[PDB]
Design an enzyme around this catalytic site. Structure first.
Site, short mmCIF file in Angstrom:
data_model
loop_
_atom_site.label_atom_id
_atom_site.label_comp_id
_atom_site.label_asym_id
_atom_site.label_seq_id
_atom_site.Cartn_x
_atom_site.Cartn_y
_atom_site.Cartn_z
N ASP A 155 -13.94 0.62 -9.37
CA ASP A 155 -13.05 -0.53 -9.22
C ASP A 155 -13.53 -1.40 -8.08
O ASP A 155 -12.72 -1.86 -7.29
CB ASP A 155 -11.59 -0.08 -9.03
CG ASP A 155 -10.55 -1.11 -9.46
OD1 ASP A 155 -10.86 -2.32 -9.44
OD2 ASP A 155 -9.41 -0.70 -9.80
N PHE A 168 0.80 -1.22 0.00
CA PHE A 168 0.00 0.00 0.00
C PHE A 168 0.85 1.29 0.00
O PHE A 168 0.29 2.37 0.18
CB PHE A 168 -0.93 0.03 1.21
CG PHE A 168 -1.83 -1.16 1.37
CD1 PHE A 168 -3.00 -1.26 0.64
CD2 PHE A 168 -1.55 -2.15 2.29
CE1 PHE A 168 -3.85 -2.34 0.80
CE2 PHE A 168 -2.40 -3.23 2.46
CZ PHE A 168 -3.54 -3.32 1.71
N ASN A 228 -10.31 -4.96 -3.21
CA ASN A 228 -10.44 -3.56 -2.77
C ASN A 228 -11.38 -3.40 -1.55
O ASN A 228 -11.89 -2.31 -1.27
CB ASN A 228 -10.89 -2.68 -3.93
CG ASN A 228 -9.87 -2.56 -5.03
OD1 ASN A 228 -8.68 -2.28 -4.80
ND2 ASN A 228 -10.30 -2.77 -6.24
N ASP A 246 -11.13 2.80 -1.13
CA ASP A 246 -10.86 3.50 -2.39
C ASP A 246 -9.35 3.85 -2.50
O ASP A 246 -8.79 4.50 -1.62
CB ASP A 246 -11.71 4.76 -2.52
CG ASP A 246 -11.30 5.62 -3.71
OD1 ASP A 246 -11.29 5.10 -4.85
OD2 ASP A 246 -10.94 6.80 -3.49
C1 LIG Z 1 -4.02 7.76 2.94
C2 LIG Z 1 -4.18 6.31 3.32
C3 LIG Z 1 -3.92 5.90 4.62
C4 LIG Z 1 -4.05 4.58 5.02
C5 LIG Z 1 -4.48 3.60 4.12
C6 LIG Z 1 -4.58 2.20 4.62
C7 LIG Z 1 -3.96 1.17 3.92
C8 LIG Z 1 -4.00 -0.14 4.36
C9 LIG Z 1 -4.66 -0.45 5.55
C10 LIG Z 1 -4.92 -1.62 6.31
C11 LIG Z 1 -4.50 -3.03 6.02
N1 LIG Z 1 -5.62 -1.32 7.40
N2 LIG Z 1 -5.83 0.03 7.36
C12 LIG Z 1 -5.27 0.60 6.26
C13 LIG Z 1 -5.23 1.91 5.82
C14 LIG Z 1 -4.75 3.98 2.79
C15 LIG Z 1 -4.61 5.31 2.42
C16 LIG Z 1 -4.96 5.28 0.95
N3 LIG Z 1 -4.28 6.32 0.15
C17 LIG Z 1 -2.90 5.96 -0.16
C18 LIG Z 1 -4.67 7.52 -0.36
O1 LIG Z 1 -5.78 7.97 -0.21
C19 LIG Z 1 -3.66 8.31 -1.16
N4 LIG Z 1 -2.75 9.03 -0.48
C20 LIG Z 1 -1.85 9.72 -1.19
C21 LIG Z 1 -1.80 9.72 -2.57
C22 LIG Z 1 -2.73 8.96 -3.26
C23 LIG Z 1 -3.68 8.23 -2.56
C24 LIG Z 1 -4.72 7.39 -3.22
F1 LIG Z 1 -5.66 8.24 -3.72
F2 LIG Z 1 -4.18 6.69 -4.26
C25 LIG Z 1 -6.44 5.05 0.67
C26 LIG Z 1 -6.59 3.58 1.07
C27 LIG Z 1 -5.22 3.05 1.69
#
Ligand SMILES: Cc1ccc(-c2ccc3c(C)n[nH]c3c2)c2c1[C@H](N(C)C(=O)c1ncccc1C(F)F)CCC2
Length: 244
Positions: free
Chosen positions: A113, A17, A118, A131
């Site tokens: 998606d 991730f 997901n 998302d």
């Molecule tokens: C910010 C964030 C914090 C924690 C997670 C998370 C992951 C795994 C777990 C697990 C396994 N438990 N909890 C969890 C949380 C995620 C995000 C993700 N994300 C990276 C963004 O929204 C984001 N940020 C910066 C640039 C682009 C994007 C995106 F739009 F592509 C959204 C879902 C995953």
């Protein structure tokens, strides 16, 4: 400020991730990351919350904190042989996805998606729709991974809530097959050709007949004729209630 302990030497999900770290919020276990972010996160700051939707816990000063999910991929969970979920549990997981989707559709959001990889699962076995940057707010308008895509989206590149309903049908299929790959002998280019031939995914071994008719309703050639996520939550609740 002083309510977040962050472990910068411990990343969640072996890098799958990006740079997301183990945290502890004041003691709640969490996931910590440091405008291109998911739209569900920007909605949770400016506007948006549902138990079946993975959303923002808070922001720290920047540090974006989300809750920790023990099983970061529902597809991996159902595919793991150490877990033996029953047909009632798998239908239950789908009902939860439909609940989160019914909520997101009320908010005029299109996922784009919706797949079992997901969706996340926690330790209390609650499913959340995540998302990773593709969901869009449709605002006033009614429109905005080919094997999960609806026929009218493959042909036009336009996505509506009814194209999410089509993907929900494939998610249901993934659930009843415990993570099997859809159309395994078909190449992603000729998917439109394969479908226009008059084809749909086969009914799996343990998929009850009433649940397969629901998947077929999700894959109706006309988008406007597909059931809504309210009808799907209603219809799936009944099927689920028939199992002990
Ligand atoms: C910010 C964030 C914090 C924690 C997670 C998370 C992951 C795994 C777990 C697990 C396994 N438990 N909890 C969890 C949380 C995620 C995000 C993700 N994300 C990276 C963004 O929204 C984001 N940020 C910066 C640039 C682009 C994007 C995106 F739009 F592509 C959204 C879902 C995953």
């Amino acid at each position: 400020p002083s309510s977040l302990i962050v472990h910068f030497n411990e990343v969640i999900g072996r890098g799958h991730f990006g740079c997301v770290y183990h945290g502890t919020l004041l003691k709640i276990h969490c996931a910590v990351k440091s405008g291109e972010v998911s739209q569900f996160l920007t909605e949770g700051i400016i506007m948006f919350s549902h138990p079946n939707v993975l959303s923002l816990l808070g922001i720290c000063l920047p540090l974006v904190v989300l809750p920790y999910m023990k099983h970061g991929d529902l597809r991996n969970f159902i595919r793991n042989e150490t877990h033996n979920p029953t047909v009632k549990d798998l239908i239950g997981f789908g009902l939860q996805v439909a609940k989160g989707m019914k909520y997101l559709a009320s908010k005029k959001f299109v996922h784009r998606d919706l797949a079992a990889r997901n969706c996340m699962l926690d330790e209390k076995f609650t499913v959340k729709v995540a998302d990773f940057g593709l969901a869009r707010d449709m605002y006033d308008k009614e429109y905005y991974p080919v094997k999960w895509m609806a026929l009218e989206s493959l042909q036009t590149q336009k996505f509506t809530t009814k194209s999410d309903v089509w993907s929900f049908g494939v998610l249901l299929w993934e659930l009843m097959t415990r993570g099997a790959p859809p159309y395994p002998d078909v190449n992603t280019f000729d998917i439109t050709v394969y479908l226009l031939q008059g084809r749909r995914l086969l009914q799996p071994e343990y998929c009850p007949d009433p649940l397969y008719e629901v998947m077929l309703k999700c894959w109706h050639p006309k988008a406007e004729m597909r059931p809504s996520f309210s009808e799907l939550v209603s219809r799936i609740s009944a099927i689920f209630s028939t199992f002990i």
